[PDB]
Write a protein that binds this ligand. Structure first.
Ligand SMILES: Nc1nc2c(ncn2[C@@H]2O[C@H](COP(=O)(O)OP(=O)(O)O)[C@@H](O)[C@H]2O)c(=O)[nH]1
Length: 178
């Protein structure tokens, strides 16, 4: 998993530890992506009640993953947050609506004013999974303005799309830090 680490090494130098949030409705495959990286160490914690955050800590970076569906206990992480990776299950046209909501509430927070966005149209390997562009529409990512965003089709399970996406993200984050 060192290619991933080499990629994240490009964020070394930031004058403050950087934070990335992997979010989305449960089942979207966030955890999978997190474990996909195979770098640093991951530890689960329950800061508040009925709330569990999985945190991957890698030399100067923090990756936090928790399910959506906006209790203020979270506002705690938006401070140093550099970007959010929004994982969407492409084979769930139902909750697709809910997600779009949860995503905008999130992206509507003041501290995430500059966070870059990477959306993962995940589970593309599954039968009946909306295309990437189909999700960019269902989330109105088009309507989003004054913000670095991008969507990518993915099969976290087979690790398809993950690297291509993170690659993009990291560069944006790095740039923005400059
Ligand atoms: N086929 C397929 N299964 C996936 C994908 N991403 C996640 N899964 C499966 O979906 C289930 C939920 O994924 P997980 O990452 O644990 O969900 P979350 O962290 O709650 O969003 C797991 O059993 C995964 O193996 C994907 O892209 N394709």
């Amino acid at each position: 998993g060192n290619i991933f680490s080499s990629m994240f090494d490009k964020l070394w130098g930031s004058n403050k530890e950087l934070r990335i949030l992997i979010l989305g409705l449960d089942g979207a495959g966030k955890t999978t992506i997190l474990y996909r990286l195979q770098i640093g160490e991951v530890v689960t914690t329950k800061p508040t009640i009925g709330f569990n955050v999985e945190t991957l800590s890698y030399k100067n970076l923090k990756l936090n993953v928790w399910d959506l569906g906006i209790r203020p206990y979270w506002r705690c992480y938006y401070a140093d947050t550099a970007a959010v990776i929004f994982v969407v299950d492409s084979t769930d046209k139902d909750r697709m609506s809910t997600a779009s909501k949860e995503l905008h509430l999130m992206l509507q927070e003041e501290e995430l004013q500059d966070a870059a966005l990477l959306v993962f149209a995940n589970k593309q390997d599954q039968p009946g999974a909306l295309s990437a562009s189909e999700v960019s529409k269902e989330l109105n990512l088009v309507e989003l303005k004054d913000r670095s965003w991008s969507i990518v089709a993915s099969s976290a399970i087979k690790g398809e799309g993950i690297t291509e996406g993170l690659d993009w993200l990291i560069d944006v984050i790095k740039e923005e830090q400059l």
